Amino acid sequence: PICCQVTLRDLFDRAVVLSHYIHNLSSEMFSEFDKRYTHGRGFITKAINSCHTSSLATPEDKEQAQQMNQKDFLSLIVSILRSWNEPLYHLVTEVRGMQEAPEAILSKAVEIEEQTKRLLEGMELIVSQVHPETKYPVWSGLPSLADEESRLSAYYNLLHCLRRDSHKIDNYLKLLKCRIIHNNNC
Amino acid sequence: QSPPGKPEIHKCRSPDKETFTCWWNPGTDGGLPTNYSLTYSKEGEKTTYECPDYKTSGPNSCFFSKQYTSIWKIYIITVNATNQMGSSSSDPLYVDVTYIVEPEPPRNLTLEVKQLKKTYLWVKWSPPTITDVKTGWFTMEYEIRLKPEEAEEWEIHFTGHQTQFKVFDLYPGQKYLVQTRCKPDHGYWSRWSQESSVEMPN
Amino acid sequence: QSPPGKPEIHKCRSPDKETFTCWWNPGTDGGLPTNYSLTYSKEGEKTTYECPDYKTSGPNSCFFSKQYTSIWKIYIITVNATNQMGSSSSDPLYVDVTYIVEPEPPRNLTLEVKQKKTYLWVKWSPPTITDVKTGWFTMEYEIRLKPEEEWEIHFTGHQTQFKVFDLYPGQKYLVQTRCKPDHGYWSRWSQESSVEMPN
C-alpha cells in the first residue's frame, strides 16, 4: 500500500460500507421477528416515542442535516452508536442463553452486535482525525423469556428502533462522506 | 340516507425522500355529496394538524412539502368524511416516511458500442431530477435488463451505484432492447425506464 | 557462522478483509539451526506483538484470525531470523488489510445449457465478503473454457453471468472463474466444473 497514512477518504469509504451492511441486517432481522411473532397483532401502537435515542438533537429533514456542523454531526453519530452497544449485547445474550430453541434471527443478531463495535472503532478514529473542541442517553432494559404480549412488545421496540437508528447512522455517514470528501458532487 | 361509510387510506409514497404523498379511498357516500379532510399527528408532538396541500397531488391526495416532511418520524394519519347526515373517520394509519421511498424511473438512457482491445455495448443513464444523489442525502442503486427483439427472458445485471455499465456477453448481429430501473440504498424499485434499442455489429 | 538473516517478506493476502495471512522466505540460515518469528505492531501505540498463529495457513507464514485483523490501523510486519550467536530483522512491511484482498474464487458455478442455436448460460455467485454480499461493489470477473492445452478466456465486466455462443456439439467442456476488486489482486481459478454438450 502506497501512502503510515489512514486517509479520511478511506475511513468514510469503510464506515459507509459497514453502516450500510448493518442496516440491511437490522431491517431483515426486524422482518424475521415480525413474520414469526408479530405480523400484525396490533403493535407499533406501543412503539411510538419508545426509542431511547429520541431525546437527542437528531436532524429530521434534508435541510436540517444541511445546516449542521460536520464535527458536531460526527459527535452525534458516535453518541448514537455507543448508545446501541448495550442493547445489541442483551439481544444476542437473551436470544441465545434464555430463548427456548431460537431461530436464525440469532445468527444475524450476532453479526450486527459484532459489526457495530467494528464501525464504532472506525468512527472514533475519524472523530479523532478531525478534532472536536467540545467533548450520551442510555437505556437497553430488555426482559428475558415466546408468549406474553408484554414481553415481546419490548423486543419489538428494540428491533424497531435498531432499524430506525441504524438507518440514520447510515444516512448521516453518507451525507457526510459527500460533503467533506466529494464537496457535494458525487 | 346516512353518514359516509368509513374511508380507507391505503398508499403513501415518497418519490425523493424529502416530501411524500398519501391517497385515500372514499367510503360509501350514504347517498349525499361528501367533503373530505386529512388529519395527522407526528411522533413526539401531541398536536394534531390538518393536511397542508390537498391540491398538489390532485384528487383524494395529500402532499407534504419539505417543510412538513420529516424523516424518521412515525406519522399517525387518519382521514375524515363529512356529509349532511353525519361524519365518519377512518382507521388511523401509522406512516413512517423512511420506508415509503419509491423513486421515479431513470432518464437519459444512452447506448454506445465501444472497444478497448474486445467489443462491448455500454449503457449510460441518469437518475431523476428530484432525488438528490449529489449531496449524498439520497444514495441510489440501479439495475438493467436486456433481451433480443423477440424473446421472453430478460437478463438482469445489478449495476450498483454506477449510472453506467458495460455489457460483454451480447451476441453480434441481433438487436437488443434495454431498460433500467432504480432503487434507494433502502427502498423500493421504480417503474422501468423508456426502452432503447440498438443492433450489434458482426 | 553468524545468522546473516536476509528474510525477504513475501506478501500478505486477505480473502475477506476479516482475516489475512503473511508469507515469508527463509533468510539464509547461515549454517546453524535458525528459528523464524514474525513480530508486528500497529502504528499509533508502541506495543509490539508476536504472531498469533504460525500453524494454520502455510509453513513459513503467519495467519491473523478475526480477532487480530482490523481494517482501521496499519500493521508493520517484521520477520526475525534467529540462531545461536546472532539475530536479524527484515525490512518492515507496511500493510493495509483492505489494500491486500485476494478473494476466494467465485462460489456456486452453474453451467445451464439453455434452449435455434444452443448456448451455454454460465452463471456464478460472488465470494463471501462484507462488501459485495449486498454492497459496494467493484467486482470484475473473468471466465475460461476448453474442451479436453489452450484455454479460451472471456472477460465479464462486473457481470455475474455470461452467455457463450457456438460450441462443438457432443463434447465435454471445462469452465473456471476469477474475480478482482479495486486495488485488490485476482482470485485463484475455481474448481473445474464440467458440462456435456447436447449430442
Side-chain angles (χ1 to χ4, degrees), chain A residues 34-49:
Chain A
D34 198 62
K35 204 172 183 191
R36 288 165 183 160
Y37 301 98
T38 308
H39 218 312
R41 279 287 180 258
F43 280 91
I44 48 177
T45 311
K46 186 57 174 63
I48 37 271
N49 294 324

PDB file of all heavy atoms in Angstrom, chain A residues 34-49:
ATOM      1  N   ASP A  34     -40.917  -9.876  13.027  1.00  0.00           N
ATOM      2  CA  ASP A  34     -42.312  -9.577  12.718  1.00  0.00           C
ATOM      3  C   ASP A  34     -42.964 -10.846  12.188  1.00  0.00           C
ATOM      4  O   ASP A  34     -43.936 -11.313  12.758  1.00  0.00           O
ATOM      5  CB  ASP A  34     -42.407  -8.466  11.664  1.00  0.00           C
ATOM      6  CG  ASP A  34     -43.797  -7.781  11.601  1.00  0.00           C
ATOM      7  OD1 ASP A  34     -44.249  -7.166  12.593  1.00  0.00           O
ATOM      8  OD2 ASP A  34     -44.418  -7.813  10.516  1.00  0.00           O
ATOM      9  N   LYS A  35     -42.417 -11.415  11.115  1.00  0.00           N
ATOM     10  CA  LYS A  35     -43.000 -12.602  10.486  1.00  0.00           C
ATOM     11  C   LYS A  35     -43.350 -13.708  11.490  1.00  0.00           C
ATOM     12  O   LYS A  35     -44.451 -14.275  11.450  1.00  0.00           O
ATOM     13  CB  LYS A  35     -42.088 -13.146   9.354  1.00  0.00           C
ATOM     14  CG  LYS A  35     -42.845 -13.983   8.289  1.00  0.00           C
ATOM     15  CD  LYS A  35     -42.015 -14.380   7.062  1.00  0.00           C
ATOM     16  CE  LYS A  35     -42.881 -15.150   6.030  1.00  0.00           C
ATOM     17  NZ  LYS A  35     -42.113 -15.801   4.929  1.00  0.00           N
ATOM     18  N   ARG A  36     -42.410 -14.006  12.382  1.00  0.00           N
ATOM     19  CA  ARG A  36     -42.530 -15.177  13.245  1.00  0.00           C
ATOM     20  C   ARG A  36     -43.227 -14.946  14.584  1.00  0.00           C
ATOM     21  O   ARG A  36     -43.578 -15.909  15.261  1.00  0.00           O
ATOM     22  CB  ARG A  36     -41.156 -15.804  13.486  1.00  0.00           C
ATOM     23  CG  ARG A  36     -40.599 -16.527  12.268  1.00  0.00           C
ATOM     24  CD  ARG A  36     -39.109 -16.815  12.420  1.00  0.00           C
ATOM     25  NE  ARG A  36     -38.550 -17.442  11.227  1.00  0.00           N
ATOM     26  CZ  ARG A  36     -37.255 -17.461  10.934  1.00  0.00           C
ATOM     27  NH1 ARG A  36     -36.385 -16.878  11.744  1.00  0.00           N
ATOM     28  NH2 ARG A  36     -36.829 -18.056   9.829  1.00  0.00           N
ATOM     29  N   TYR A  37     -43.427 -13.686  14.962  1.00  0.00           N
ATOM     30  CA  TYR A  37     -44.002 -13.347  16.268  1.00  0.00           C
ATOM     31  C   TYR A  37     -45.029 -12.208  16.256  1.00  0.00           C
ATOM     32  O   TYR A  37     -45.973 -12.218  17.028  1.00  0.00           O
ATOM     33  CB  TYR A  37     -42.898 -12.974  17.260  1.00  0.00           C
ATOM     34  CG  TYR A  37     -41.844 -14.028  17.529  1.00  0.00           C
ATOM     35  CD1 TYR A  37     -40.617 -13.996  16.872  1.00  0.00           C
ATOM     36  CD2 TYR A  37     -42.063 -15.038  18.463  1.00  0.00           C
ATOM     37  CE1 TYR A  37     -39.642 -14.947  17.124  1.00  0.00           C
ATOM     38  CE2 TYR A  37     -41.094 -15.992  18.723  1.00  0.00           C
ATOM     39  CZ  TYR A  37     -39.882 -15.942  18.050  1.00  0.00           C
ATOM     40  OH  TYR A  37     -38.900 -16.885  18.299  1.00  0.00           O
ATOM     41  N   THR A  38     -44.851 -11.217  15.400  1.00  0.00           N
ATOM     42  CA  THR A  38     -45.821 -10.133  15.366  1.00  0.00           C
ATOM     43  C   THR A  38     -46.758 -10.217  14.153  1.00  0.00           C
ATOM     44  O   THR A  38     -47.907 -10.658  14.256  1.00  0.00           O
ATOM     45  CB  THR A  38     -45.139  -8.773  15.326  1.00  0.00           C
ATOM     46  OG1 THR A  38     -44.188  -8.678  16.391  1.00  0.00           O
ATOM     47  CG2 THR A  38     -46.197  -7.648  15.441  1.00  0.00           C
ATOM     48  N   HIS A  39     -46.263  -9.769  13.003  1.00  0.00           N
ATOM     49  CA  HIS A  39     -47.015  -9.842  11.752  1.00  0.00           C
ATOM     50  C   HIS A  39     -48.419  -9.264  11.889  1.00  0.00           C
ATOM     51  O   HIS A  39     -49.368  -9.839  11.376  1.00  0.00           O
ATOM     52  CB  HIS A  39     -47.113 -11.299  11.272  1.00  0.00           C
ATOM     53  CG  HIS A  39     -46.992 -11.451   9.790  1.00  0.00           C
ATOM     54  ND1 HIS A  39     -47.707 -10.676   8.905  1.00  0.00           N
ATOM     55  CD2 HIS A  39     -46.234 -12.284   9.035  1.00  0.00           C
ATOM     56  CE1 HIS A  39     -47.395 -11.020   7.668  1.00  0.00           C
ATOM     57  NE2 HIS A  39     -46.504 -11.994   7.721  1.00  0.00           N
ATOM     58  N   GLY A  40     -48.560  -8.145  12.588  1.00  0.00           N
ATOM     59  CA  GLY A  40     -49.866  -7.544  12.777  1.00  0.00           C
ATOM     60  C   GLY A  40     -50.189  -7.438  14.246  1.00  0.00           C
ATOM     61  O   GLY A  40     -49.641  -6.575  14.925  1.00  0.00           O
ATOM     62  N   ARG A  41     -51.060  -8.315  14.736  1.00  0.00           N
ATOM     63  CA  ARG A  41     -51.420  -8.334  16.149  1.00  0.00           C
ATOM     64  C   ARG A  41     -51.975  -6.990  16.615  1.00  0.00           C
ATOM     65  O   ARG A  41     -53.131  -6.897  17.048  1.00  0.00           O
ATOM     66  CB  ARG A  41     -50.216  -8.740  16.987  1.00  0.00           C
ATOM     67  CG  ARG A  41     -49.969 -10.233  17.052  1.00  0.00           C
ATOM     68  CD  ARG A  41     -51.005 -10.913  17.934  1.00  0.00           C
ATOM     69  NE  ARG A  41     -50.809 -12.361  18.015  1.00  0.00           N
ATOM     70  CZ  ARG A  41     -51.531 -13.263  17.350  1.00  0.00           C
ATOM     71  NH1 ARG A  41     -52.513 -12.873  16.551  1.00  0.00           N
ATOM     72  NH2 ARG A  41     -51.270 -14.560  17.487  1.00  0.00           N
ATOM     73  N   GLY A  42     -51.144  -5.957  16.518  1.00  0.00           N
ATOM     74  CA  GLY A  42     -51.558  -4.602  16.798  1.00  0.00           C
ATOM     75  C   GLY A  42     -50.476  -3.829  17.505  1.00  0.00           C
ATOM     76  O   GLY A  42     -50.748  -3.095  18.451  1.00  0.00           O
ATOM     77  N   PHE A  43     -49.240  -3.999  17.055  1.00  0.00           N
ATOM     78  CA  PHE A  43     -48.105  -3.331  17.701  1.00  0.00           C
ATOM     79  C   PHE A  43     -47.926  -1.903  17.208  1.00  0.00           C
ATOM     80  O   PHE A  43     -48.908  -1.238  16.894  1.00  0.00           O
ATOM     81  CB  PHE A  43     -46.821  -4.149  17.553  1.00  0.00           C
ATOM     82  CG  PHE A  43     -46.720  -5.284  18.533  1.00  0.00           C
ATOM     83  CD1 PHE A  43     -47.207  -6.546  18.218  1.00  0.00           C
ATOM     84  CD2 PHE A  43     -46.159  -5.079  19.783  1.00  0.00           C
ATOM     85  CE1 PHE A  43     -47.124  -7.575  19.117  1.00  0.00           C
ATOM     86  CE2 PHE A  43     -46.068  -6.115  20.694  1.00  0.00           C
ATOM     87  CZ  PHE A  43     -46.554  -7.365  20.355  1.00  0.00           C
ATOM     88  N   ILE A  44     -46.683  -1.436  17.161  1.00  0.00           N
ATOM     89  CA  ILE A  44     -46.384  -0.031  16.882  1.00  0.00           C
ATOM     90  C   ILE A  44     -47.439   0.912  17.409  1.00  0.00           C
ATOM     91  O   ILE A  44     -47.537   2.043  16.937  1.00  0.00           O
ATOM     92  CB  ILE A  44     -46.264   0.304  15.368  1.00  0.00           C
ATOM     93  CG1 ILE A  44     -47.446  -0.271  14.596  1.00  0.00           C
ATOM     94  CG2 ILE A  44     -44.960  -0.166  14.788  1.00  0.00           C
ATOM     95  CD1 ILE A  44     -47.432   0.081  13.152  1.00  0.00           C
ATOM     96  N   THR A  45     -48.270   0.443  18.335  1.00  0.00           N
ATOM     97  CA  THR A  45     -49.255   1.312  18.967  1.00  0.00           C
ATOM     98  C   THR A  45     -48.519   1.752  20.214  1.00  0.00           C
ATOM     99  O   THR A  45     -48.524   2.919  20.603  1.00  0.00           O
ATOM    100  CB  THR A  45     -50.531   0.543  19.355  1.00  0.00           C
ATOM    101  OG1 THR A  45     -50.980  -0.238  18.243  1.00  0.00           O
ATOM    102  CG2 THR A  45     -51.645   1.498  19.808  1.00  0.00           C
ATOM    103  N   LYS A  46     -47.871   0.765  20.817  1.00  0.00           N
ATOM    104  CA  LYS A  46     -46.952   0.964  21.907  1.00  0.00           C
ATOM    105  C   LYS A  46     -45.516   0.891  21.370  1.00  0.00           C
ATOM    106  O   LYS A  46     -44.668   0.201  21.936  1.00  0.00           O
ATOM    107  CB  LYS A  46     -47.194  -0.105  22.983  1.00  0.00           C
ATOM    108  CG  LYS A  46     -46.391   0.055  24.281  1.00  0.00           C
ATOM    109  CD  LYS A  46     -46.636   1.428  24.935  1.00  0.00           C
ATOM    110  CE  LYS A  46     -45.943   1.525  26.290  1.00  0.00           C
ATOM    111  NZ  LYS A  46     -44.466   1.411  26.185  1.00  0.00           N
ATOM    112  N   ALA A  47     -45.242   1.599  20.277  1.00  0.00           N
ATOM    113  CA  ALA A  47     -43.865   1.752  19.817  1.00  0.00           C
ATOM    114  C   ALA A  47     -43.498   3.189  19.466  1.00  0.00           C
ATOM    115  O   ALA A  47     -42.332   3.503  19.201  1.00  0.00           O
ATOM    116  CB  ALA A  47     -43.583   0.819  18.654  1.00  0.00           C
ATOM    117  N   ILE A  48     -44.492   4.066  19.468  1.00  0.00           N
ATOM    118  CA  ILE A  48     -44.213   5.464  19.195  1.00  0.00           C
ATOM    119  C   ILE A  48     -43.611   6.125  20.418  1.00  0.00           C
ATOM    120  O   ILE A  48     -44.130   6.001  21.513  1.00  0.00           O
ATOM    121  CB  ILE A  48     -45.470   6.242  18.781  1.00  0.00           C
ATOM    122  CG1 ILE A  48     -46.665   5.743  19.568  1.00  0.00           C
ATOM    123  CG2 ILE A  48     -45.780   6.000  17.315  1.00  0.00           C
ATOM    124  CD1 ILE A  48     -47.380   4.591  18.886  1.00  0.00           C
ATOM    125  N   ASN A  49     -42.510   6.835  20.220  1.00  0.00           N
ATOM    126  CA  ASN A  49     -41.835   7.542  21.303  1.00  0.00           C
ATOM    127  C   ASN A  49     -41.115   6.567  22.218  1.00  0.00           C
ATOM    128  O   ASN A  49     -40.670   6.936  23.308  1.00  0.00           O
ATOM    129  CB  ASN A  49     -42.828   8.387  22.112  1.00  0.00           C
ATOM    130  CG  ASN A  49     -43.421   9.521  21.305  1.00  0.00           C
ATOM    131  OD1 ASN A  49     -42.747  10.112  20.478  1.00  0.00           O
ATOM    132  ND2 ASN A  49     -44.681   9.836  21.550  1.00  0.00           N
TER     133      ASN A  49
END
